Design a protein around this nucleic acid. Structure first.
Lengths: 119, 139, 119
RNA sequence: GCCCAGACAGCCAGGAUGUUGGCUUAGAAGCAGCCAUCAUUUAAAGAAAGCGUAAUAGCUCACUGGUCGAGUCGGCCUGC
């Protein structure tokens, strides 16, 4: 495909689609030859934009449990892993999830009464 | 089919009737305490007679019930680690028994699937929070 | 500034920036108060987007037949099925495989002279 | 002394995990009584301030967010 076309294709690909991609090139060409695309692909400004999916916990509902329960069930935490971060809300309830999964997670949390925003 | 209740706790392996403490309870939710009795002390047989294991039980959709005897160790061996029969009326004033560091990580791990926490040091604790408010010394 | 404006503003900064904001808030408000902000920050999908694997064919190059061979060996698809998955490059060569697998898999495609991508 | 980092009260959703803490008790399982009142999971949940059960359950409160939106609160003294 045209080089310009490839550039545009990469811009459309979610950072997830590009990560496994650079690691992919790494297997064949090697860390040396694949270094070119690896260093150029990373700049997908996914971090430089503060973005988009994820399940951000804007609010959650005056009680932990319900919210944390969902968190504990979605992440898997005892009594200091989803009770020192799920409050401020470190919205990173989960990462690298599709639109549907992120949508489903949001639902579960909202059911517990968690005002979640999906970036 | 839409009518369903759910709740059950720790029942002494062998005890059921009479009504108190288990009568109108889970008796006015659809299931009766006629059977379900010999349907508990006839499955929990070959274990420890003195083991308050909480069997999870749904309710009904017809009239019947259901059963699932999960897993104490955890709670037991904790009371039977510093005298379960003779305890201190006011725990924190005196002691009753003692436990080593080995038997601290022992009752630990063996309940991680209910007890919640990352790292074993976080597990060794909490149980150290549950350490004693019932005699028994830490060391 | 409008709350909505702030949300967008935040979703514009770069990793470094937000860490500077959440830190400033911590010094001003405090680990307890500033907590409510060191949250919405983190989820700046820098890791969420990426640290997960499926193989995808970007291009087969001039060695279509060669690429097909590899595909026919990995997937086991017939000649007609294989070529159909190589020509239009319907991506997904095989999914549900681990990192090493999806990794090594491509280490059998590019050798045939094909540009692969894993999502 | 507290005040424009909109809180204090409404409304929405939320009050957990070890655990029914122990002892005691026919039973008591946050909530008869006797002792303590720790920790694990978070903006925030007291091994629990009330209603409730035969004992559970169920329902509220404390605690904190969202939404609703400006001075408030504690105290001293004096005139009638």
């Amino acid at each position: 495909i045209t080089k310009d076309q490839i550039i545009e294709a990469v811009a459309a690909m979610s950072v997830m689609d590009v990560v496994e991609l650079i690691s992919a090139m790494e297997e064949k060409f090697g860390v040396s030859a694949a270094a070119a695309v690896a260093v150029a692909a990373g700049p997908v400004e996914a971090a430089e934009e503060k973005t988009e999916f994820d399940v951000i916990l804007k609010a959650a509902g005056a009680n932990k449990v319900a919210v944390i329960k969902a968190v504990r069930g979605a992440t898997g935490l005892g009594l200091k892993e989803a009770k020192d971060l799920v409050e401020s809300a470190p919205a990173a309830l989960k990462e690298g999830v599709s639109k549907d999964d992120a949508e489903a997670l949001k639902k579960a949390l909202e059911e517990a009464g968690a005002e979640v925003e999906v970036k | 089919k839409k009518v369903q209740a759910y709740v059950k706790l720790q029942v002494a392996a062998g005890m059921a009737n009479p009504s108190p403490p288990v009568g109108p309870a889970l008796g006015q939710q659809g299931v009766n305490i006629m059977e379900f009795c010999k349907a508990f002390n006839a499955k929990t047989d070959s274990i420890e007679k003195g083991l308050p294991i909480p069997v999870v039980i749904t309710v009904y959709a017809d009239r019947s019930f259901t059963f699932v005897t999960k897993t104490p160790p955890a709670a037991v061996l904790l009371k039977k680690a510093a005298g379960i029969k003779s305890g201190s009326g006011k725990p924190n004033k005196d002691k009753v028994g003692k436990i080593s560091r080995a038997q601290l990580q022992e009752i630990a791990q063996t309940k991680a699937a209910d007890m919640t926490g990352a790292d074993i040091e976080a597990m060794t604790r909490s149980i150290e929070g549950t350490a004693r408010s019932m005699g028994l010394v830490v060391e």
